[PDB]
Amino acid sequence: WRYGPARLWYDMLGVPEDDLLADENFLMVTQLHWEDDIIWDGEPWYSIFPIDNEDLVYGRWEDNIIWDAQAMPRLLEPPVLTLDPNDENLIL
């Protein structure tokens, strides 16, 4: 959407239509300083748990990383605002 959020960028552009890869290495026991957590001398009809972002949990957002600007493997498209209503703190 040309007139939506990011209209400023669209106007500036002037477009007007409209073995180290082994799975264990990445397990967070081998990548997290969990020692810091140890506490020493410290001093359901509706969901009980919260619902996670399905796009973060499931989608391949990694496909929106632009590795090479000139050699971009696919063609990206303008993104429309989707106003997810799962999030609270949004009136609608």
Binding site: N25, N53, I65
Partner: protein, 403 residues
């Protein structure tokens, strides 16, 4: 395309105005290819008075000048102001069209209002072009939806972070970081940031990317708004600021290097605050960084970004990701201590990669080695990482003395 003539059934109608009862179809074909031949010879000779007398209209005095030319008697009564009327007659099987002429009392033509007297031909001079374009004299041609409050707040805050001045930018970032009610404007900010980082591919502006990364860093420091539902948009924007290869307009002088370690610190914060075992944010970020680093053909800028993010994640990550590929430093020093092309741009990026690598691997060498470290540098790759490790042990001793 073809020779078009008057219809043959139009000559049976004409022959019955004469009184001829039955006219055979070969006679009607003989009539209509002659009268449509004489129409085309007065159609094209009327056009010779329309063209030589420059008119482009073909008035009825052009046909009367052509009937005078073909010796045929004139057609009387076609100079009066008329038009083309026709009146349909349905009838009991006989379909036709006629004129339906009207009458007028004779004293209403003797007593008509007379038109105004005509004017005589005179001349008028005016300039059409004066050594160039035409003058402008009159003888020439003329030549869910944001409320207005928060819409205005969104406009002012986004246009304050585009780069007109620095003080309005600092107050806008201190607004974003410290306001309580900025929800309902978080999706607009996420869309603005992600599309603006995408617009770097059309214009490789380092400055606007630094401004968008300071916008993300200000969005993270807000205690009231929760970025859990919108982090899937801000993660690849910061990732694009890390592992893309052209971050600069002039590659040699622009310090894309800082937008690298700033965005690497940003993504370490974004996967410290938000990584949950349902999310798998940190494991999926380490996997992208790792397969971008271990894979050859990657440019020194994107390898710098990969090493920077991996080394900002923490100590155990550089233990189990960076330290196996320390032999890659030899492949780096292949192109540093001995390069056939010295004046290329690979050398500054290579020794930037080298400096970052030995700066981050000096405390890792200080953690998992002996306290002496006599010839660890010789045992290390290129003997430089080991000197950096000795410097790091000295720095740790100085920190202990300060404590």
């Amino acid at each position: 395309l073809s020779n078009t003539v008057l219809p043959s059934e139009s000559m049976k109608v004409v022959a019955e105005s004469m009184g001829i009862a039955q006219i055979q179809e070969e006679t009607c074909q003989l009539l209509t290819d002659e009268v449509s031949y004489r129409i085309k010879e007065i159609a094209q000779d009327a056009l010779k008075f329309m063209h030589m007398g420059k008119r482009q209209k073909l008035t009825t005095s052009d046909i009367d000048y052509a009937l005078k030319l073909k010796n045929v008697e004139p057609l009387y009564g076609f100079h009066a102001q008329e038009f083309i009327p026709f009146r349909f007659a349905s009838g009991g099987g006989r379909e036709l069209y006629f004129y339906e002429e009207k009458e007028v009392d004779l004293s209403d033509i003797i007593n008509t209002p007379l038109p105004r007297v005509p004017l005589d031909v005179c001349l008028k001079a005016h300039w059409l072009s004066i050594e160039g374009c035409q003058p402008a004299i009159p003888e020439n041609p003329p030549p869910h939806e944001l409320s207005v409050e928060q819409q205005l707040y969104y406009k002012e805050i986004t246009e304050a972070c585009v780069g007109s001045c620095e003080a309005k930018r600092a107050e806008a970032l201190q607004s974003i970081a410290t306001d309580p009610g900025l929800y309902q404007m978080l999706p607009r900010f996420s869309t603005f940031i992600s599309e603006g980082v995408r617009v770097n591919v059309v214009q490789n502006n380092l400055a606007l990317l630094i401004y968008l990364m300071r916008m993300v860093k200000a969005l993270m420091d807000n205690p009231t708004l929760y970025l859990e539902k919108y982090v899937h948009e801000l993660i690849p924007a910061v990732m694009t600021c890390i592992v893309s290869r052209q971050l600069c307009l002039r590659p040699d002088v622009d310090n894309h290097w800082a937008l690298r370690d700033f965005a690497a610190r940003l993504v370490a914060q974004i996967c410290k605050h938000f990584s949950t075992t349902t999310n798998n944010i940190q494991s999926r970020i380490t996997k992208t960084f790792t397969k971008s680093w271990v894979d050859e053909k990657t440019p020194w800028t994107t390898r710098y970004g990969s090493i920077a993010g991996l080394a900002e994640l923490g100590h155990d990550v550089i233990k189990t990701l960076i330290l196996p590929r320390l032999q890659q430093e030899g492949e780096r020093i292949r192109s540093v201590l001995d390069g056939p092309v010295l004046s290329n741009i690979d050398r500054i990026g290579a020794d930037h990669v080298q400096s970052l690598l030995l700066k981050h691997c000096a405390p890792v060498l200080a953690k998992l080695r002996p306290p002496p470290d006599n010839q660890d540098a010789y045992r290390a790759e290129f003997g430089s990482l080991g000197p950096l490790l000795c410097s790091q042990v000295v720095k740790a001793r100085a920190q202990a003395a300060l404590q």
